């Protein structure tokens, strides 16, 4: 009956940890979830032979995926840093 009640720079924290309060918190929440999803999809489609295997030694092996994780990782850091 009396667990919690909804009650500055720290204020967005309540918005941040309750993303269904403000538009900016909700959009950041959804987009970082999308980033987690796209990073794991990048990993799995890296593992497939068509992407990162010598399927055609004669000729593809994209090293562009080596960027996709890093950016995503850095993105995640900021919200962690936000929680710092």
């Amino acid at each position: 009956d009396a667990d919690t009640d909804t009650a500055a720079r720290q204020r967005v924290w309540r918005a941040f940890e309750n993303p269904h309060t403000s538009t900016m918190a909700l959009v950041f929440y959804y987009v970082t979830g999308f980033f987690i999803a796209v990073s794991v999809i990048a990993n799995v489609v890296e593992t497939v032979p068509c992407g990162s295997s010598p399927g055609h030694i004669k000729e593809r092996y994209a090293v562009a995926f080596f960027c996709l994780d890093t950016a995503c990782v850095m993105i995640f850091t900021v919200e962690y840093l936000l929680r710092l």
């Binding site: 538009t23 959804y30 987009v31 999308f34 090293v63 960027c67 996709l68």
Partner: protein, 51 residues
């Protein structure tokens, strides 16, 4: 809600375009050299093959 979805669309198109630029700039080589030229009848009868 749906305006927040528009905000998602804007942020995702920005990030997608910037990472597309990143993956366009990173492959500095983006090129390779294939096999050389084989020998045909014209090559035998080409002036270059004259002894």
């Amino acid at each position: 809600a749906k305006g927040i979805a528009i905000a998602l669309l804007v942020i995702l198109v920005i990030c997608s375009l910037i990472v597309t630029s990143v993956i366009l700039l990173t492959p500095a080589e983006d090129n390779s050299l294939s096999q050389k030229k084989k020998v045909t009848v014209e090559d035998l009868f080409s002036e270059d093959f004259k002894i």
